[PDB]
C-alpha cells in the first residue's frame, strides 16, 4: 500500500505536526497537514459552551463578521442565557430587597 | 480465496487449528455487547409497537 | 573529605523547589484601611488543588476600594468553605468560618488558621492541612493575645494580627499509608529533590561521618551538639533525649 | 543540517572555492618553489570543524 511522508521538515509526531492521508486528483496518496481543532467558546459564569458562537482558532475570529461571534442578547457571546436570566433576576430581587432594608431601617430608627 | 471459502463452509476450525485462546479469537465482551444490544433493540421495538407496555418493558430491560 | 549531602543542599542547584504548577503564594489580603476599620466582602470563585500542597486553595475576589477593578487573592481554603460563598475580612467582620478577623476580635477558644505572626505579614501559622491555632487568652493592656500553635507551643501575638476562622481543609491526609515507593516519588517530584534517601552508614567515610567500617554502624554518638559545624551536623542535632518515649 | 545559518553557509562557500588544485602556470614562474596545494581539504579525510 502507498506510504506517505511528512511534508514539512518536522519529523516528529507533535500535536502541531498532525496529518491525514488524502487521495489527490493524480490518483496517489499524500499526507495533508491538519491544523489543531478549535475549542468552543465557554460561558464566563458557568463554563459551558456558548450556543450560537462559531468555533474557530483565536486569530480566525478577526476574519468573520460579528454575527458569528455573538448572540442578540445582553452578554450575547460571553454568557449562556441562563446565567443572564439569573443575573437579571438576582439584580432585580436584590435591588428591591435593598429598598425594603432601608425602609425597615428608617422604621426601626423611629422607635426612639 | 479457496481457503476463505472453505473456512466459511466450516473447515480448518477444529481444536488442532486454534492457537489463541477463545477470548483472543473472539472477546466475550464483544459477544455480550452484541447480545445485549439485540435484546434492547427488541424490547424498544416491542414497546414502540405496543406489543408490551412500559412496565413490562422496564422489568424486561432490568432482567 | 568530601562535601556531604546536607551541605550540598544549601547551594540550591538541584535542590530548589518545583514551582511550575503552583497557583501562586497563598496569603491574606494586604492589610489596608478597609480591613483596619471595617470589613470588606469577597466572593469564593474556585476551590483548586495546589501542586505540592496538601491543603486546597480558595480563590477569592474582592473589589478594589480605590480603582474600578477586581483583585484576586489566593487563600488557603478552610473546611466548609464553598464556591459562591461570601467571605468577610476586617475588624468588624462576623465570627464565621472563612472570615478574616484580628485576633483581638475573637473570644477565647476560637479556632483560627493562617494566623499572622505580625500584623500585615499576610499569614504564617497553621497553614498545613488539618492544622489550626487556638485562641487562649487576651491581654488588652499590652494589646496581645495568647495562642496555642499546632506544635503545642504557646505564643503571644499582636492583637492586630489576623486569622481565618476555622481549620485548614484537607485533614487526615497523612492517615493513609503510601504503600509503595512510587507514591512517595510522585509526592516529592511536585515538592523538591529530597527522595529517595541514602543512609549515611551505607556510604564511605569520604561521603559521610557515618561512612565506612567493616560493619554498618555509626561508631560514635549520633547526638551532635549545637556548636558543631557544617559537615558535622548529621544525626540527632542538640537532642535533649533519645529513645522511645515512655519505655 | 539542511537548516544552516548564513554564517555556516558563508564558511562552506569559502571552503568550496578554496577546494581546487594548484594552478599550473604558477609552477612556471621565475624562482617558483610551490609544487602542489599543501592546504588541500577533502570531506572524507579532514573535517573543517564548522
Amino acid at each position: 500500500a502507498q506510504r506517505v511522508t511528512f511534508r514539512r521538515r518536522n519529523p516528529y509526531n507533535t500535536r502541531s505536526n498532525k496529518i491525514k492521508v488524502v487521495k489527490t486528483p493524480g490518483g496517489i496518496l499524500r499526507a495533508q497537514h491538519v491544523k489543531k481543532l478549535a475549542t468552543r467558546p465557554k460561558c464566563g459564569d458557568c463554563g459551558s459552551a456558548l450556543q450560537g458562537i462559531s468555533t474557530l482558532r483565536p486569530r480566525q475570529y478577526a476574519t468573520v463578521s460579528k454575527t458569528h461571534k455573538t448572540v442578540s442578547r445582553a452578554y450575547g457571546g460571553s454568557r449562556c442565557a441562563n446565567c443572564v436570566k439569573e443575573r437579571i433576576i438576582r439584580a432585580f430581587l436584590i435591588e428591591e430587597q435593598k429598598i425594603v432594608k432601608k425602609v425597615v431601617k428608617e422604621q426601626t430608627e423611629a422607635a426612639k | 480465496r479457496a481457503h476463505a471459502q472453505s473456512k466459511r463452509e466450516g473447515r480448518h476450525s477444529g481444536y488442532g487449528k486454534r492457537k489463541g485462546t477463545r477470548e483472543a479469537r473472539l472477546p466475550s465482551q464483544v459477544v455480550w455487547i452484541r447480545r445485549l444490544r439485540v435484546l434492547r433493540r427488541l424490547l424498544a421495538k416491542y414497546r414502540d409497537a405496543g406489543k408490551i407496555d412500559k412496565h413490562l418493558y422496564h422489568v424486561l430491560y432490568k432482567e | 573529605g568530601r562535601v556531604i549531602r546536607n551541605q550540598r543542599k544549601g547551594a540550591g542547584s538541584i535542590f530548589t523547589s518545583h514551582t511550575r504548577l503552583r497557583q501562586g503564594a497563598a496569603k491574606l489580603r494586604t492589610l489596608d484601611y478597609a480591613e483596619r476599620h471595617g470589613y470588606i466582602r469577597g466572593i469564593v470563585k474556585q476551590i483548586v488543588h495546589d501542586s505540592g500542597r496538601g491543603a486546597p486553595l480558595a480563590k477569592v475576589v474582592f473589589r478594589d476600594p480605590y480603582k474600578y477593578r477586581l483583585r484576586e487573592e489566593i487563600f488557603i481554603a478552610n473546611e466548609g468553605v464553598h464556591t459562591g460563598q461570601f467571605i468577610y475580612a476586617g475588624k468588624k467582620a462576623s465570627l464565621n468560618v472563612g472570615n478574616v478577623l484580628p485576633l483581638g476580635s475573637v473570644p477565647e477558644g476560637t479556632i483560627v488558621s493562617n494566623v499572622e505572626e505580625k500584623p500585615g505579614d499576610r499569614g504564617a501559622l497553621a497553614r498545613a492541612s488539618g492544622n489550626y491555632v487556638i485562641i487562649i487568652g487576651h491581654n488588652p493592656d499590652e494589646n496581645k493575645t495568647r495562642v496555642r500553635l499546632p506544635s503545642g507551643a504557646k505564643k503571644v501575638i499582636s492583637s492586630d494580627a489576623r486569622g481565618v476562622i476555622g481549620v485548614i481543609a484537607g485533614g487526615g491526609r497523612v492517615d493513609k499509608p503510601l504503600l509503595k515507593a512510587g507514591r512517595a516519588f510522585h509526592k516529592y517530584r511536585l515538592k523538591r529533590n529530597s527522595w529517595p534517601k541514602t543512609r549515611g552508614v551505607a556510604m564511605n567515610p569520604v561521603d559521610h561521618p557515618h561512612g565506612g567500617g567493616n560493619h554498618q554502624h555509626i561508631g560514635k554518638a549520633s547526638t551532635i551538639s549545637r556548636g558543631a559545624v557544617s559537615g558535622q551536623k548529621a544525626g540527632l542535632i542538640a537532642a535533649r533525649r533519645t529513645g522511645l518515649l515512655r519505655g | 543540517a539542511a537548516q544552516k545559518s548564513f554564517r555556516i553557509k558563508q564558511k562552506m562557500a569559502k571552503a568550496k572555492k578554496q577546494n581546487r588544485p594548484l594552478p599550473q602556470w604558477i609552477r612556471l614562474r621565475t624562482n617558483n618553489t610551490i609544487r602542489y596545494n599543501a592546504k588541500r581539504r577533502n570531506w572524507r579525510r579532514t573535517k573543517m570543524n564548522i
Binding site: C46 | - | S94, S129, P177 | -
Partner: protein
C-alpha cells in the same frame, strides 16, 4: 456473586504490602470514593476531585473538606465551637 471475602477494593494490590496496611488503605479508599449528600441541592452527587476538594456533579458546588471524607470530626467540632462562640457574643 461474592468475588472476594474481605479485601474488597484492595484486591487490586494482590498479596503485597501487608494485610494491616491494606486494611488501613481500604477504609480510607472506601471513604474517598464514596458518594455524599449535597448540602446545597440534596442529591447523592458529591465526589472528590482532589484531596480536600468535594464537587457536586449537579449544581456544580465545590466545598473544601477532608482529604478522604467530606467532613472531618474535628471540623464538625470546630463548626459547633464557632457557632457557640458567635451566639454567645451575640447574647
Amino acid at each position: 456473586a461474592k468475588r472476594t471475602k474481605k479485601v474488597g477494593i484492595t484486591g487490586k494490590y494482590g498479596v503485597r504490602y501487608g494485610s494491616s496496611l491494606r486494611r488501613q488503605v481500604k477504609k480510607l479508599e472506601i471513604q474517598q470514593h464514596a458518594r455524599y449528600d449535597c448540602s446545597f441541592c440534596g442529591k447523592k452527587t458529591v465526589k472528590r476531585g482532589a484531596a480536600g476538594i468535594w464537587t457536586c456533579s449537579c449544581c456544580k458546588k465545590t466545598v473544601a473538606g477532608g482529604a478522604y471524607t467530606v467532613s472531618t470530626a474535628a471540623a464538625a467540632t470546630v463548626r459547633s465551637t464557632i457557632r457557640r462562640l458567635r451566639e454567645m457574643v451575640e447574647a
